[PDB]
């Protein structure tokens, strides 16, 4: 069951997701930096975890260099665009719940996923690289539950809405890629599941009841 990390085939799709690996975590190092001017008495904390997307981004470069392949950048941009200009939009408004659900809880869970998911068909060099960002995953995930579970009651109608918009993104971005995850032998069930459970978890924490996690999926099916 593990692939051919030799092949044409595999190197060829492996060129398109590490990009969005390496994409995702620069996005996530600068979203940290941004929500800095939001929350300014917070810089130092932000800038120590934009500091970790860094040390992330150089790893998986340092994936993709050790299998001889080389990340197409662009399709890795055109990928995250939707769901950088949201971000966008919504620091430009001032809106900390939103860009904190979006960088701090869906993406943190998008990234936890994916490693999960990737880690038990990974190459040796890139296992013992993912295996090592997956700690840092669940301080971002503590980091954005921490602040929305203080800030709760003055945000709920926001982070339905941030959820009704960005939820459905999410599952589009996933689509767009399944079919590379699955030359990389990630099945498209898995990456659901644990997305689901993390994001569940973190909504749980947040202090969101059953019925209200059940409107946020009722909001992003409608
Ligand atoms: C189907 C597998 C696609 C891989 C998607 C990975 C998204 C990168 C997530 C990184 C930006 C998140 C973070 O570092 O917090
Ligand atoms: C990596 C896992 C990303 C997929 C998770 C998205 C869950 C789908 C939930 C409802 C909002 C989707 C829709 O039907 O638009
Ligand atoms: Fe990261
Ligand atoms: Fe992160």
Same mark, same amino acid.
């Given at each position: 069951?593990?692939?051919? *990390?030799?092949?044409?085939?595999?190197?060829?799709?492996?060129?398109?997701?590490?990009?969005?690996?390496?994409?995702?975590?620069?996005?996530?190092?600068? +979203?940290?930096? $941004?929500?800095?001017?939001?929350?300014?008495?917070?810089?130092?904390?932000?800038? @120590?975890?934009?500091?970790?997307?860094?040390?992330? &981004?150089?790893? *998986?470069?340092?994936?993709?260099?050790?299998?001889? /392949?080389?990340? =197409?950048?662009?399709?890795?941009?055109?990928?995250?665009?939707?769901?950088? =200009?949201?971000?966008?939009?919504?620091?430009?408004?001032?809106?900390?719940?939103?860009?904190?659900?979006?960088?701090?809880?869906?993406?943190?869970?998008?990234?936890?996923?994916?490693?999960?998911?990737?880690?038990?068909?990974?190459?040796?060099?890139?296992?013992?690289?993912?295996?090592? /960002?997956?700690?840092?995953?669940?301080?971002?995930?503590?980091?954005?539950?921490?602040?929305? &579970?203080?800030?709760?009651?003055?945000? @709920?109608?926001?982070?339905?809405? $941030?959820?009704?918009?960005?939820?459905?993104?999410? @599952? @589009?971005?996933?689509?767009?890629? $399944?079919?590379?995850?699955? /030359?990389?032998?990630?099945?498209?069930?898995?990456?659901?599941?644990? *997305?689901?459970?993390?994001?569940?978890?973190?909504?749980?924490?947040?202090?969101? +009841?059953?019925?209200?996690?059940?409107?946020?999926?009722?909001?992003?099916? /409608?």
């Amino acid at each position: 069951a593990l692939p051919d *990390f030799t092949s044409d085939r595999y190197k060829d799709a492996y060129s398109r997701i590490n990009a969005i690996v390496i994409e995702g975590e620069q996005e996530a190092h600068d +979203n940290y930096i $941004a929500i800095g001017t939001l929350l300014p008495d917070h810089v130092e904390e932000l800038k @120590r975890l934009a500091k970790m997307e860094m040390r992330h &981004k150089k790893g *998986f470069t340092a994936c993709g260099k050790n299998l001889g /392949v080389e990340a =197409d950048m662009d399709f890795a941009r055109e990928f995250f665009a939707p769901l950088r =200009d949201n971000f966008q939009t919504a620091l430009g408004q001032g809106k900390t719940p939103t860009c904190l659900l979006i960088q701090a809880l869906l993406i943190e869970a998008f990234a936890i996923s994916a490693y999960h998911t990737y880690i038990p068909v990974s190459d040796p060099f890139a296992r013992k690289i993912t295996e090592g /960002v997956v700690k840092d995953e669940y301080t971002h995930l503590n980091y954005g539950e921490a602040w929305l &579970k203080a800030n709760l009651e003055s945000c @709920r109608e926001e982070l339905l809405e $941030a959820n009704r918009e960005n939820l459905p993104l999410i @599952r @589009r971005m996933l689509d767009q890629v $399944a079919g590379d995850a699955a /030359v990389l032998q990630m099945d498209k069930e898995d990456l659901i599941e644990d *997305f689901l459970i993390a994001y569940q978890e973190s909504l749980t924490e947040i202090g969101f +009841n059953t019925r209200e996690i059940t409107r946020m999926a009722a909001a992003a099916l /409608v």
